[model samples]
Target chain A: EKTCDLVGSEKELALLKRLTPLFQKSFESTVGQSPDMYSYVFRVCREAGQHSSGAGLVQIQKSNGKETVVGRFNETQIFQGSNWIMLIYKGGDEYDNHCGREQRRAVVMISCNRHTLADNFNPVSEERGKVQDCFYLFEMDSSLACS
Target chain B: EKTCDLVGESEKELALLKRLTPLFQKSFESTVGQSPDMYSYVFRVCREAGQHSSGAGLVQIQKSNGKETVVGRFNETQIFQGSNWIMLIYKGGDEYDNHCGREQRRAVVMISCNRHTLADNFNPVSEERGKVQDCFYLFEMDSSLACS
Candidate 1:
């Protein structure tokens, strides 16, 4: 009961244990679904403080199949709550399509506790003369997958 | 302690849920995924025979694109769930006319849920109330369930 020590407070540790898996569960159920376009999140990094700073990477699995874009991203904002940390950042990946290059605007909103996370993104694309919107959510923990 | 009564099983389940706040955040199991700028309403719901209490609500939604617009908001008044299902009850909130065409009117709503590992939002079972000038009507939004 006493041998295991965690990084944050008792509440934070409780959050890490209780909240992390749900993010992964939600993410697993949401991402990797679209028969059209999506991003594969590889990793995330965070530093502590009032103005926490962090970054992460995404593999934009492009439509054209032969090519892909590796996006290096930065957090635009960071918010913390009783048991969670949420980061909001800009979006997406570039892969091959057919005629013109496919471009999209998406927001990567990542939420986590000290140990695990769930990332939800909704991508709006300009394919034709119009726009289309699709959403994807993914979750992970640095302690579990990042290590 | 008497009339707020529950079937023993319901009481036990409720106790378990009280300790499990994440039970609701996953939106009763759907694991809500909103657009880039949407608010996630997180709160606690508790009750008894003589009185009721539900506070500590956190509402957060940011507006982007250099324009101010209303997104959505939810309130509390819920009391129903099983071992694998729960409902979200909300009242007295507003939604901006950011869609096709609309105005303002107070509303009340109820939604359902289900789960295996924790919870899952099953459906947005129902909602009500609207009156504008000289007209009155009821609206419906459902195919599976309104996760919103």
Candidate 2:
């Protein structure tokens, strides 16, 4: 009975580990190539952080043969800093001077912790321009995963 | 004394005539490159037309500047119609094309009269990407002063 319980617990842990990465990928895909989507995610994370002292949620869904998951953290649970989230999407080339091909690789990091995600969270200054008003930290290429 | 009166009257007429072109030029200069200025002018002209029941002011400004002025009737004004005040500052040629100057010296037309000026009042639909919203309209040459 004891051995059986241990095996069952191990299975559950492995399942959870698998689900966590999927959820993170799904969240990234949903928000990729969409400024509005990114802003929505930030707003949702900030709101969640405000409501609970420390909270986190991870959800997974399977649609049309693809598995995806979304994870969010709250102020009390996650450490807050300047750039909590990093997002990367595909478009354009650096030296080619033209938009080469549609690349399907991106990486993003999100930070909405208590210290940084406060009521007085003013990430950017207004004098820069309208574009600067919508502040997202790092937009990078995600061709390499887990690196 | 009669001669003096006649000279005085002639001088007054000449002064008015001389001021006509300058006044028109000043108005054009003030409103040539700005969307807000063009919008304000259009509104003022429309209001004047409504009050006076005449198109004299509209026609005079339009014709005086060697440009076409068009005003929509009734509900047409609310829609996307051509501007009432249109002016062409310069004509393009070989000089405008070489040295990659075509982008800088494109033929510009001001097409907003008595309506909300479109984005920058020049090329409303230009989607070149990362272009400034309110940029100065470039012309082949300045037309603030007319040929004497």
| Predicted structure with the largest TM-score when compared to the true one | 1
The Cα error of candidate 2 at residue A99, in Å, is 35
Candidate 2 Cα misplacement greater than 4 A, ranges: A1-147, B1-23, B27-89, B93-107, B115-148
Candidate 2 lDDT at B43 equals 19
Backbone clashes for every candidate come to 8, 13
Q: Estimate the lDDT of model 1.
A: 0.27
Model 2 chain A poorest 10 in a row by lDDT? A1-10
lDDT of candidate model 2 versus the reference: 0.22
Which pairs clash (backbone N, Cα, C closer than 3 Å) in model 1?
A27-A138, A62-A95, A64-A96, A64-A97, B28-B120, B29-B119, B29-B120, B30-B121
RMSD vs true structure, all candidates: 17.3, 25.4
The Cα error of candidate 1 at residue B4, in Å, is 26
- Could you tell me the TM-score of candidate 1? 0.27
DockQ score, prediction 1: 0.01
Candidate 1 per-residue lDDT, tens place, B54-92, comes to 221212222232222111123322233221112233322
How many Å off is the CA of A35 in candidate 1?
7.6
Runs with alpha carbons beyond 4 Å of true place in candidate 1: A1-39, A45-59, A66-72, A91-133, A142-147, B1-69, B73-148
